[PDB]
Design a protein around this ligand. Structure first.
Ligand SMILES: NCC1CCN(c2ncnc3[nH]cnc23)CC1
Lengths: 337, 20
């Protein structure tokens, strides 16, 4: 059963969680090819592992920048979790290491680019197209939540398309293993649950609210709560009044009403029957959950490819040195990494 | 239209995370 699959996955996870892999490679084992994305502590690059010729995505964080941004514990969360998970729609760590200046995490490369890019270009996804992605997220969250993990940054920018048109949920920077409630103000304005905005203790139900935002955005082409400044976005979210495009099917609206529910006692994914209230909603009635998990379903969109390290599905970013100081920075802070 | 309001907004690009 699902319960059986998940208990076994938890046994697997905890072994790695309690005894994390550390220092399993070094920088010069990799050829750096291109920056695929950037962020507050550095970037993610396409790299080639020389010994195998395999391509990977290497995330590089500047330790000093992590420290300035007060993201030390969050970064340690990211690495410790990613080395420990294993799931079809996640990119676990193949390798990690650090040097005087940086932290390095090496993961499976998803060559299809960000969902964000395709969603914006095309405008919006059909309900079947949105459902294919949504199913994969539902399953990932099922997996993650069973391990007492909250993800906390679902959005198109953070969903990578693979060669088969399936998803990888990347960007574990805010992911946290927590039983019960937590309090950090984090996430992305458009996707923040009202509990977060109202500075309450919250739980994994914030991820299910964020799923409502994503499905809405995929199907509409814009999010349910938007405005030029975050404060105005927060005011809309806490009203919770959502308006649906006329093209939204009856079932879709009903799903979204139950995901984008300000009342935690009624929010889908947070009820006594957990994720099954979502899995068994009418909008997903055509979804074969096992076949999605097995990647047997035919993806509604498959990315245009030229080669194994072709990068044409990514935007171009300015390439910046990877500099390594002769002095070790922030040794204590990142000792366990 | 809502689509037109979105595309004219400053939030159609990649959206940054917030923290504390
Ligand atoms: N949030 C958007 C970023 C785009 C670049 N990234 C990336 N790109 C490709 N394959 C990958 N495997 C793991 N991360 C990752 C990281 C995420």
């Amino acid at each position: 059963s699902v319960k059986e699959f998940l208990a076994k996955a938890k046994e697997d996870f905890l072994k790695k969680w309690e005894n994390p892999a550390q220092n399993t490679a070094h920088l010069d084992q990799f050829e750096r090819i291109k920056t695929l994305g950037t962020g507050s502590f550095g970037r993610v690059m396409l790299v080639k592992h020389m010994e195998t010729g395999n391509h990977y995505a290497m995330k590089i964080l500047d330790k000093q920048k992590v420290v300035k941004l007060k993201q030390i514990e969050h970064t340690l969360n990211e690495k410790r979790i990613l080395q420990a998970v294993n799931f079809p729609f996640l990119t676990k760590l193949e390798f990690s290491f650090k040097d005087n200046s940086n932290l390095y995490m090496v993961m499976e490369y998803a060559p299809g680019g960000e969902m964000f890019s395709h969603l914006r270009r095309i405008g919006r996804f059909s309900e079947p197209h949105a459902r294919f992605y949504a199913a994969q997220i539902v399953l990932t969250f099922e997996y993650l939540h069973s391990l007492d993990l909250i993800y906390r940054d679902l959005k198109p920018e953070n969903l990578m398309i693979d060669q088969q048109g399936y998803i990888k949920v990347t960007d574990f920077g805010f992911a946290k293993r927590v039983k019960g409630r937590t309090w950090t103000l984090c996430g992305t304005p458009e996707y923040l649950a009202p509990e977060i905005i109202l500075s309450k203790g919250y739980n994994k139900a914030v991820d299910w609210w964020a799923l409502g935002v994503l499905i809405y955005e995929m199907a509409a082409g814009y999010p349910p709560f938007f405005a030029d400044q975050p404060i105005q976005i927060y005011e809309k979210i806490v009203s919770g009044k959502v308006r649906f495009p006329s093209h939204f099917s009856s079932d879709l609206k009903d799903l979204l009403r139950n995901l984008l529910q300000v009342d935690l006692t009624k929010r889908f994914g947070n009820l006594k029957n957990g994720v099954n209230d979502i899995k068994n909603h009418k909008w997903f009635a055509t979804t074969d959950w096992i076949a999605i998990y097995q990647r047997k379903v035919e993806a509604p969109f498959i990315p245009k490819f030229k080669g194994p390290g072709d990068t044409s599905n990514f935007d171009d970013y300015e390439e910046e040195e990877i500099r390594v100081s002769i002095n070790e920075k922030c040794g204590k802070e990142f000792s366990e990494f | 239209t809502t689509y037109a309001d979105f595309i004219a907004s400053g939030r159609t690009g990649r959206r940054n995370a917030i923290h504390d």
